[PDB]
Write an enzyme that holds these catalytic residues in place. Structure first.
Site, PDB file in Angstrom:
ATOM      1  N   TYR A 169       1.381  -4.910   1.270  1.00  0.00           N
ATOM      2  CA  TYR A 169       2.413  -4.315   2.112  1.00  0.00           C
ATOM      3  C   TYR A 169       3.146  -5.426   2.855  1.00  0.00           C
ATOM      4  CZ  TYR A 169       0.234   0.053   0.974  1.00  0.00           C
ATOM      5  OH  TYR A 169      -0.215   1.063   0.151  1.00  0.00           O
ATOM      6  N   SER A 170       4.477  -5.357   2.873  1.00  0.00           N
ATOM      7  CA  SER A 170       5.291  -6.338   3.590  1.00  0.00           C
ATOM      8  C   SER A 170       5.011  -6.237   5.085  1.00  0.00           C
ATOM      9  CB  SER A 170       6.787  -6.093   3.349  1.00  0.00           C
ATOM     10  OG  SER A 170       7.086  -5.923   1.979  1.00  0.00           O
ATOM     11  N   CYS A 214      14.952  -6.546  -0.973  1.00  0.00           N
ATOM     12  CA  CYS A 214      13.628  -5.935  -0.888  1.00  0.00           C
ATOM     13  C   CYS A 214      13.655  -4.416  -0.984  1.00  0.00           C
ATOM     14  CB  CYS A 214      12.922  -6.367   0.404  1.00  0.00           C
ATOM     15  SG  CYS A 214      11.138  -6.025   0.426  1.00  0.00           S
ATOM     16  N   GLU A 257      12.007  -9.496  -3.525  1.00  0.00           N
ATOM     17  CA  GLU A 257      10.699  -8.856  -3.565  1.00  0.00           C
ATOM     18  C   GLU A 257      10.868  -7.360  -3.799  1.00  0.00           C
ATOM     19  OE1 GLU A 257       7.610  -9.677  -0.435  1.00  0.00           O
ATOM     20  OE2 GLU A 257       7.763  -7.502  -0.161  1.00  0.00           O
ATOM     21  N   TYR A 317       9.215  -3.743  -5.984  1.00  0.00           N
ATOM     22  CA  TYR A 317       7.908  -3.198  -6.362  1.00  0.00           C
ATOM     23  C   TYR A 317       7.963  -1.744  -6.802  1.00  0.00           C
ATOM     24  CZ  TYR A 317       8.449  -2.277  -1.321  1.00  0.00           C
ATOM     25  OH  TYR A 317       8.940  -1.925  -0.078  1.00  0.00           O
TER      26      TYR A 317
HETATM   27  C1  LIG Z   1       4.838  -7.470  -2.251  1.00  0.00           C
HETATM   28  C2  LIG Z   1       4.766  -5.966  -2.055  1.00  0.00           C
HETATM   29  C3  LIG Z   1       5.106  -5.460  -0.886  1.00  0.00           C
HETATM   30  C4  LIG Z   1       5.062  -4.080  -0.640  1.00  0.00           C
HETATM   31  N1  LIG Z   1       5.427  -3.623   0.549  1.00  0.00           N
HETATM   32  C5  LIG Z   1       5.360  -2.342   0.839  1.00  0.00           C
HETATM   33  C6  LIG Z   1       5.791  -1.834   2.191  1.00  0.00           C
HETATM   34  O1  LIG Z   1       6.185  -2.538   3.115  1.00  0.00           O
HETATM   35  N2  LIG Z   1       5.695  -0.462   2.383  1.00  0.00           N
HETATM   36  C7  LIG Z   1       5.264   0.424   1.410  1.00  0.00           C
HETATM   37  O2  LIG Z   1       5.227   1.636   1.637  1.00  0.00           O
HETATM   38  N3  LIG Z   1       4.923  -0.095   0.185  1.00  0.00           N
HETATM   39  C8  LIG Z   1       4.934  -1.398  -0.131  1.00  0.00           C
HETATM   40  N4  LIG Z   1       4.619  -1.818  -1.384  1.00  0.00           N
HETATM   41  C9  LIG Z   1       4.028  -0.853  -2.411  1.00  0.00           C
HETATM   42  C10 LIG Z   1       2.562  -0.661  -2.050  1.00  0.00           C
HETATM   43  O3  LIG Z   1       1.821  -1.818  -2.351  1.00  0.00           O
HETATM   44  C11 LIG Z   1       1.782   0.367  -2.890  1.00  0.00           C
HETATM   45  O4  LIG Z   1       2.161   0.202  -4.294  1.00  0.00           O
HETATM   46  C12 LIG Z   1       2.310   1.796  -2.606  1.00  0.00           C
HETATM   47  O5  LIG Z   1       2.103   1.981  -1.206  1.00  0.00           O
HETATM   48  C13 LIG Z   1       1.642   2.859  -3.349  1.00  0.00           C
HETATM   49  O6  LIG Z   1       0.208   2.623  -3.309  1.00  0.00           O
HETATM   50  P1  LIG Z   1      -0.786   3.869  -3.298  1.00  0.00           P
HETATM   51  O7  LIG Z   1      -2.103   3.327  -3.163  1.00  0.00           O
HETATM   52  O8  LIG Z   1      -0.245   4.771  -2.287  1.00  0.00           O
HETATM   53  O9  LIG Z   1      -0.563   4.483  -4.769  1.00  0.00           O
HETATM   54  P2  LIG Z   1      -1.438   4.460  -6.133  1.00  0.00           P
HETATM   55  O10 LIG Z   1      -2.439   5.487  -5.810  1.00  0.00           O
HETATM   56  O11 LIG Z   1      -1.828   3.057  -6.402  1.00  0.00           O
HETATM   57  O12 LIG Z   1      -0.447   5.051  -7.128  1.00  0.00           O
HETATM   58  C14 LIG Z   1       0.442   4.147  -7.715  1.00  0.00           C
HETATM   59  C15 LIG Z   1       0.716   4.588  -9.124  1.00  0.00           C
HETATM   60  O13 LIG Z   1       1.446   5.824  -9.149  1.00  0.00           O
HETATM   61  C16 LIG Z   1       2.557   5.691 -10.051  1.00  0.00           C
HETATM   62  N5  LIG Z   1       3.947   5.927  -9.483  1.00  0.00           N
HETATM   63  C17 LIG Z   1       4.612   5.294  -8.433  1.00  0.00           C
HETATM   64  N6  LIG Z   1       5.714   5.921  -8.041  1.00  0.00           N
HETATM   65  C18 LIG Z   1       5.829   7.033  -8.904  1.00  0.00           C
HETATM   66  C19 LIG Z   1       6.780   8.125  -9.028  1.00  0.00           C
HETATM   67  N7  LIG Z   1       7.644   8.574  -8.093  1.00  0.00           N
HETATM   68  N8  LIG Z   1       6.792   8.780 -10.195  1.00  0.00           N
HETATM   69  C20 LIG Z   1       5.770   8.566 -11.037  1.00  0.00           C
HETATM   70  N9  LIG Z   1       4.679   7.790 -10.913  1.00  0.00           N
HETATM   71  C21 LIG Z   1       4.804   6.983  -9.826  1.00  0.00           C
HETATM   72  C22 LIG Z   1       2.216   4.440 -10.905  1.00  0.00           C
HETATM   73  O14 LIG Z   1       1.203   4.773 -11.895  1.00  0.00           O
HETATM   74  C23 LIG Z   1       1.649   3.548  -9.792  1.00  0.00           C
HETATM   75  O15 LIG Z   1       0.851   2.479 -10.393  1.00  0.00           O
HETATM   76  C24 LIG Z   1       4.638  -3.184  -1.655  1.00  0.00           C
HETATM   77  C25 LIG Z   1       4.269  -3.750  -2.895  1.00  0.00           C
HETATM   78  C26 LIG Z   1       4.310  -5.085  -3.101  1.00  0.00           C
HETATM   79  C27 LIG Z   1       3.887  -5.571  -4.481  1.00  0.00           C
END
Ligand SMILES: Cc1cc2nc3c(=O)[nH]c(=O)nc-3n(C[C@H](O)[C@H](O)[C@H](O)COP(=O)(O)OP(=O)(O)OC[C@H]3O[C@@H](n4cnc5c(N)ncnc54)[C@H](O)[C@@H]3O)c2cc1C
Length: 295
Positions: A71-72, A253, A293, A295
């Site tokens: 997370y950023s 971003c 950046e 994602y």
């Molecule tokens: C460098 C970086 C910085 C980030 N910064 C932030 C930040 O500041 N704030 C923030 O909220 N997030 C940020 N993210 C994204 C964050 O890391 C997580 O990916 C996000 O919060 C979702 O994780 P989760 O555990 O909730 O979902 P998970 O349970 O891990 O589910 C993710 C999976 O669901 C699927 N998916 C995603 N979107 C959809 C959709 N609408 N339709 C269909 N399938 C989908 C894919 O299979 C994905 O791999 C950042 C990512 C990176 C790489």
């Protein structure tokens, strides 16, 4: 100088939630939360533009422990209270479709974070990232192109630049350049940190410009919903003219998808002066002045 990986997944820092506040106002789409964590008792330090990892509890569908999500960082190095004691995140709850079996699917780490209570212990790793760092040069121009939670690193830059308490705390960085945030969200309720962004623009009209692209409230000239690429196209000549400066940095971003239309807009602008944007951009990346950046 840059702090990196002071804590790693095998032995994370255990911080405590201080607060968890909503950023999407009534009538907005989705849930985005500002979450502040206590860093006292550890040595986690960080700077603007970096990320941290969060390791959510539980196992995945295969019975394997959940791993970190990045997370950023949404706060400056000093934290929101300018006391060097905390760190903040800007987290959207991921939820989605039926072609992923069930009904609405809720993301694991983001649901855990958006619903977390003050007092709870959290596994934190990092910090990580050297690609979204702000120049130390107080006369640099800074273009910021953000959608949704991509506002997070932009908040760390603008707070360092413009908050009174930041200015008092950072003798070495008294910003006098020009910064321009173009920010795309679906509604006015969804404008994360709206009040503070507009306050900064009012105090610093010559040093900060704020432009919104609000898709549910605005149409582009073709009749479609307004997105950030539409605003960049509208202001392509202005943005290219700033980008030409040796001291200008650009930051992009948010969720992936924004770059293609941004490039097409800047490509048409640069082409008028006999410049191929794709080649100029390669040199900007090489110089550390084009930061992305997604994602
Ligand atoms: C460098 C970086 C910085 C980030 N910064 C932030 C930040 O500041 N704030 C923030 O909220 N997030 C940020 N993210 C994204 C964050 O890391 C997580 O990916 C996000 O919060 C979702 O994780 P989760 O555990 O909730 O979902 P998970 O349970 O891990 O589910 C993710 C999976 O669901 C699927 N998916 C995603 N979107 C959809 C959709 N609408 N339709 C269909 N399938 C989908 C894919 O299979 C994905 O791999 C950042 C990512 C990176 C790489």
């Amino acid at each position: 100088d840059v702090p990196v990986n002071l804590y790693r997944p095998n032995a994370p820092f255990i911080g405590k939630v201080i607060s968890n506040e909503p950023l999407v106002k009534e009538g907005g789409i989705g849930i985005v939360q500002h979450i502040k964590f206590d860093l006292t008792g550890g040595n986690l330090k960080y700077i603007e533009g970096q990320s941290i990892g969060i390791i959510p509890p539980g196992v995945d569908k295969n019975g394997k422990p959940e791993e970190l999500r990045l997370y950023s960082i949404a706060s400056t190095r000093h934290g929101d209270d300018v006391d060097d004691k905390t760190i903040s995140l800007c987290v959207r709850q991921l939820e989605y479709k039926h072609p992923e079996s069930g009904e609405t699917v809720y993301g694991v780490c983001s649901t855990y974070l958006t619903h977390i209570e003050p007092g709870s212990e959290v596994k934190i790793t990092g910090p990580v990232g050297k690609e979204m760092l702000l120049p130390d040069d107080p006369e640099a121009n800074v273009i910021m192109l953000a959608t949704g939670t991509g506002i997070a690193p932009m908040r760390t830059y603008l707070w360092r630049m413009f908050k009174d308490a930041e200015r008092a705390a950072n003798p070495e960085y008294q910003f006098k350049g020009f910064s321009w945030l173009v920010f795309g969200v679906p509604t006015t309720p969804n404008i994360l940190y709206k009040e503070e962004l507009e306050e900064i623009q009012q105090k610093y009209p010559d040093n900060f410009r704020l432009t919104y692209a609000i898709s549910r409230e605005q149409k582009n000239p073709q009749g479609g919903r307004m997105y950030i690429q539409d605003r960049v196209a509208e202001h392509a000549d202005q943005l290219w003219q700033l980008i030409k400066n040796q001291k200008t940095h650009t930051y992009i971003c948010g969720l992936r998808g924004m770059e293609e239309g941004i490039d097409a807009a800047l490509s048409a602008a640069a082409a008028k002066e006999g410049v191929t944007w794709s080649d100029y951009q390669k040199d900007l990346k090489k110089a550390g002045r084009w930061h992305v950046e997604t994602y």
